[PDB]
Design brief:
The structure is a homodimer.
Chain A lengths: L1 H8 L1 H10 L3 E4 L8 H12 L3 E4 L10 E3 L14 H4 L10 H13 L6 E2 L8 E4 L21 E3 L2 E6 L6 E5 L2 E5 L2 E3 L7 H10 L5 E7 L3 H7 L9 H9 L4 E4 L6 E3 L4 E15 L8 E2 L4 E13 L4 E3 L9 H20 L4 E5 L8 E6 L1 H4 L6 H13 L9 E6 L7 H11 L6 E3 L14 H6 L5 E4 L13 E2 L8 H14 L5
Parallel strand pairs in A: 1-2, 3-17, 4-12, 19-20, 20-22
Antiparallel strand pairs in A: 2-3, 5-16, 6-9, 7-8, 7-11, 9-10, 10-16, 11-14, 12-13, 14-16, 18-19, 21-22
Helix pairs in contact in A: 1-2, 5-8, 5-9, 7-8
Bound molecules: flavin mononucleotide (2 copies), manganese (II) ion (2 copies) and sodium ion (NA) (2 copies).
């Protein structure tokens, strides 16, 4: 119980804790960062195997390690989310709802500022100027048709508004360009893109750092679409109940977590670019052609002894673009909806849907008082959700009554198949602007910048009057409470035991 | 194992030998308790329960719950279903579909008529008929009555004797020798019975309960009109089904059936039947008048086993049997019509409310068409068939995904269906009347619930694909995939 709480704030301890859970495999065989690491980890995601810690990567800095699947799922269904739950210090049986509830409580708690320290483990090794050689690290080629090797797939950028009011921590990919330059996207609706654009009106480049192997709770928050201007570091402290220990970078004054595995520092160039990508991505596809992206100059880097580089091998679910990102989006969307007065009691970005839809659980004993109907409700939800920072990331919304558990894909499918009426429940919103990464967009959607948004209504019409056409024929809903308890009571005595 | 396909009692014994059967010796109430246990068995994917000690029931009589439920062990999940066809425990949807389709291509093997058989060990005639002596369950709390037949099939015969039809249909208990159940006019029972209404006499009928599992499966299969189920079963298992004559009306039933009911379907007598939890997962509140089935005689084996199906949320036998049979029949219909379809699957999770069509991407381009035209073509062919009429929604997706895996179907629905281009409603095509989302407008018009969801990217109709799949199988060369599989144990995973 103590090991779990230290796991939230210490990546190295997090890894040791995974091993104690039996959720880590120590790979001592020599492995090739050219595709092999990426292949092993992909198979780990899809088999829901323990996270691999790679101890020996060919042609890499001696002692350097790689952690694959830092928040992959486990095969054991009772502990399937334990690796993700451990990012917040939660026990192994924690599930989606437990994680979301804790993420929301931290939103309403006052931030706990980071504790500034003079020294930290991240400073045990410092490479300055000409010592910087990113190619010495075990930088993987993650997919066969990738456009380059990716240094940052599981770290977050650290930048600061010029006025010093807003400390932004955000996860974004960074491709390896040469020994001291990286390149990665800065979509204008993400917070790095906004602050970076705050520096272009000052004639200066953006001072920048990236933390890799950062405190797991800090990494999760960096992958969370918190509202604009909100500092991620204070939300992490509030989430774990104590400040995140930080130190100053070696060359630009930004504060990064003190026990980070690897810290990069430099600046984001104002107009230099390099062809970046393509890369297998969260939607599950590898698109064929890359795009020019801003260059990240690395003036210095520091790392702990025997540094662990965590990676994410993006693709078909479930990987960290779903377990981390989708989870964080779900909790933010729940807060967005409830704050707007919408009758939503849970939101879940089904991992199986590759973070391309969110299922909203509708409190049916609140629906009647709205005096509305499917078409009006869908439009109201669309404006509210899609207009939020978190809701902008997700193109499809499914609305269903809270009689189903929206975290269970089988129940969501049951509701889609049996409740969505083909003529009445398909609400496209072609005027709402799209998130540009949605894989089914066509040339026309990309020219207008909209066309991909959808609300699928699974609320029967009578539910807007507080009624329901039929009861559910299931164990829970087709038998009286006294009989259900008797069956649950005697289950083992009938002869079933644990099955 | 092939014994199991032709012998319900051996099938039960085979399940126990597999470790897939729980013998319940605790006394249980057929009033709701048996249904509640079995419903939980479906949802937990537990072993099939055999109830030996049924309160208030005929001595020696037993009840088999979840005869075709799924198992928690994912490697053997479909073993109980597969054993209906004599297939091994690791058989999956595709193996089952392939075998059901080979059976369509073999010529039928007529049943072998015997004069004696185990089903005749006990005979009740006329006033001996007391259906209430059997462990007739009340399956759901709000059900309209107790159901004797949830896992048996009607046996009727054309007046010409050209067509012996076996069809699964529910039968509610009305009184000690009368039952009532639906005979929807598009089903084959309703067509043959309404051929008898043109004759002056009622429809002679029998129901086999605890029949040979292979016969039960076929009876739950929408084979074309005029096709005799019994001959298809023989072709499926490779040998005739042994059948004997009924004791009182000359209809022929399988010889080792657990329980055989005999009588006739009255022309115009009805009784308020239902409601009952149904395949779509819902219990609607009000019943309907349905034809009365008069039971003049019945026969059963010593210590008879009454199989039951507790309809509701998936997966139960309305999905594992019915859905599977529909999928195989739909694959045949589609391929016979020339559609470029290589697999069809009625996802159990969708409660037999949608069918996923796996599109052979290498044949699509030669059609020179597009999503709208293809969807309309698929709609006409599929919904127009006997099997396709049962399913209101079709999903078309390329065969790069495994359409039997709901996680992959969901990935495709979410990442390939464009909200503006891929939602093809067909409000003019007649509906299957049980579809739960129909409104008053559809039930008065007789149509409005049909839909085709297109998950084929537009470039696929030209034989192209916008992007490769980022997965282990599709993002790495074959040699690396082999090396990772070979050295998996060296890495430290050991069966992970
Ligand atoms: C492993 C992982 C990788 C991610 N990579 C990217 C990325 O490359 N580009 C991007 O725009 N968002 C990416 N995200 C999502 C962002 O981290 C997320 O939207 C976050 O809210 C951004 O922070 P911000 O709200 O301060 O902009 C990733 C998330 C995770 C979990
Ligand atoms: C367990 C089970 C129960 C079924 N119950 C019914 C039913 O009550 N009413 C009905 O119309 N069809 C029911 N069916 C569907 C029929 O068995 C199926 O449509 C079959 O093809 C009918 O035979 P037919 O083609 O000769 O009409 C059931 C199927 C199964 C597997
Ligand atoms: Mn932010
Ligand atoms: Mn038939
Ligand atoms: Na963030
Ligand atoms: Na049939």
């Amino acid at each position: 119980f103590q090991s779990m709480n230290r796991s939230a704030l210490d990546f190295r301890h997090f890894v040791d804790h995974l091993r104690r859970q039996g959720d880590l495999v120590d790979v001592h065989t020599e492995v090739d960062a050219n595709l092999e690491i990426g292949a092993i980890t992909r198979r780990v995601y899809e088999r829901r195997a323990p996270a691999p810690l790679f101890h020996n990567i060919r042609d890499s800095l001696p002692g350097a390690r790689v952690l694959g699947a830092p928040a992959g799922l486990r095969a054991d269904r009772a502990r399937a989310h334990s690796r993700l739950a451990l990012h917040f210090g939660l026990p192994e049986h924690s599930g989606p709802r437990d994680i979301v509830a804790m993420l929301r409580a931290a939103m309403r708690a006052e931030p706990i500022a980071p504790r500034r320290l003079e020294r930290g483990p991240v400073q045990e090794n410092v490479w300055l100027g000409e010592q910087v050689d990113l190619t010495r690290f075990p930088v993987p080629l993650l997919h066969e048709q990738d456009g380059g090797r990716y240094f940052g797939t599981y770290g977050f950028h650290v930048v600061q508004t010029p006025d010093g009011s807003w400390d932004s921590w955000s996860v974004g990919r960074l491709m390896l360009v040469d020994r001291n330059t990286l390149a990665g996207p800065t979509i204008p609706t993400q917070h790095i893109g906004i602050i970076r654009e705050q520096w272009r009106r000052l004639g200066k480049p953006t001072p920048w750092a990236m933390a890799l192997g950062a405190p797991p709770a800090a990494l999760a928050a960096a992958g969370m679409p918190l509202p604009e201007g909100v500092s991620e570091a204070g939300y992490v402290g509030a989430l774990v109940g104590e400040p995140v220990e930080v130190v100053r970078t070696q060359t630009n004054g930004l504060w990064v977590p003190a026990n980070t595995e690897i810290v990069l520092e430099g600046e984001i160039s104002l107009d230099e670019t390099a062809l970046e990508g393509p890369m297998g991505e969260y939607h599950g596809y590898s698109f064929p052609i890359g795009k020019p992206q801003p260059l990240f100059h690395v003036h210095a880097l520091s790392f702990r002894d025997q540094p662990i580089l965590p990676i994410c091998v993006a693709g078909t679910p479930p990987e960290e673009h779903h377990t981390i990102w989708g989870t964080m989006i779900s909790a933010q969307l729940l807060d967005v909806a409830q704050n707007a007065g919408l009758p939503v009691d849970m939101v879940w970005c089904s991992y199986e849907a590759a973070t391309c839809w969110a299922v909203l659980s509708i409190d049916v004993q609140r629906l009647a008082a709205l005096g509305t109907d499917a078409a009006a409700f869908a439009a109201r939800v669309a404006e509210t959700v899609f207009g939020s920072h978190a809701g902008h990331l997700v193109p499809k919304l499914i609305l269903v009554g809270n009689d189903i558990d929206v975290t269970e894909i089988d129940q969501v499918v049951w509701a889609l198949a049996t409740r969505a009426h083909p003529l009445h429940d398909h609400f496209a919103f072609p005027q709402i602007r799209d998130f540009p990464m949605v894989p089914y967009l066509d040339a026309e959607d990309k020219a207008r910048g909209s066309g991909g948004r959808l609300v699928i209504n699974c609320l029967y019409p009578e539910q807007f009057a507080g009624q329901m056409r039929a009861a559910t024929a299931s164990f829970r809903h087709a038998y009286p409470t006294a009989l259900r308890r008797r069956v649950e009571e005697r289950w083992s005595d009938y002869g079933f035991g644990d099955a």
